[PDB]
Amino acid sequence: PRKKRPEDFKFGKILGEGSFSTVVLARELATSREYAIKILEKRHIIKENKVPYVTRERDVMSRLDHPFFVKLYFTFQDDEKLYFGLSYAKNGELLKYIRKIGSFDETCTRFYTAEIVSALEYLHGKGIIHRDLKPENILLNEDMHIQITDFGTAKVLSFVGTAQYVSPELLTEKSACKSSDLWALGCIIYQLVAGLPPFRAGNEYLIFQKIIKLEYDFPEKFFPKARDLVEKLLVLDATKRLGCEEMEGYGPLKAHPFFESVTWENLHQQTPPKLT
Ligand SMILES: NC(=O)Nc1ccc2c(c1)=C(Cc1cc(-c3cccc(C(=O)NCCN4CCCCC4)c3)c[nH]1)C(=O)N=2
Any idea what the CATH number is for the domain that residue 41 is in? 3.30.200.20
Domain end marker among 29, 58, 92 = 92
132, 243: one domain: yes
* Domain membership of residue 50 as a residue range: 1-92
Resolution attained, angstroms: 2.1
For a ligand 1 pocket test, name from 11, 13, 15, 276 the mutation site with the most ligand atoms within 8 angstroms of its C-beta: 15
Whole-angstrom Cα Rg for the chain: 19
Q: Is 234 left (phi over 0), alpha (psi -120 to 50) or beta?
A: beta
263, 152: one domain: yes
CB atoms within 10 A of CB 87: 17
197, 70: one domain: no
Does the beta carbon of 238 sit less than 6 angstroms from any atom of ligand 1? no
Report yes or no: 73 and 10 within 8 Å, Cβ to Cβ: no
For a ligand 1 pocket test, name from 57, 87, 139, 142 the mutation site with the most ligand atoms within 8 angstroms of its C-beta: 139
Query: Is residue 5 classed as helix, strand or coil in its secondary structure?
Result: coil
228, 201: one domain: yes
Report yes or no: 148 and 184 within 8 Å, Cβ to Cβ: no
76, 212: one domain: no
Does the beta carbon of 150 sit less than 6 angstroms from any atom of ligand 1? yes
Does the beta carbon of 38 sit less than 6 angstroms from any atom of ligand 1? yes
109, 205: one domain: yes
Report yes or no: 154 and 60 within 8 Å, Cβ to Cβ: yes
98, 224: one domain: yes
DSSP, res 213: H
From CA 198, how far away is CA 66, in angstroms rounded?
A: 29
Please confirm, yes or no, whether 132 is among the known catalytic residues: yes
Domain end marker among 70, 92, 114 = 92
133, 63: one domain: no
Which residues have C-beta within 8 Å of that of residue 245, sequence separation ≥ 6? Answer: 178, 179
98, 74: one domain: no
How many domains is the chain partitioned into structurally? Answer: 2
Helices (H), 74-203: 94-101, 106-125, 168-172, 178-194
73, 123: one domain: no
63, 146: one domain: no
Give 25 Cα–ligand 1 centroid separation in angstroms: 10
51, 110: one domain: no
The method of structure determination was: X-ray
Does the beta carbon of 87 sit less than 6 angstroms from any atom of ligand 1? yes
Burial class (CB in 10 A: 0-12, 13-18, 19+), 42: middle
Domain end marker among 92, 123, 155 = 92
Burial class (CB in 10 A: 0-12, 13-18, 19+), 216: middle
From CA 12, how far away is CA 24, in angstroms rounded?
A: 7
Which amino acid type is present at position 19?
Answer: S
The CATH number covering residue 173 comes to: 1.10.510.10
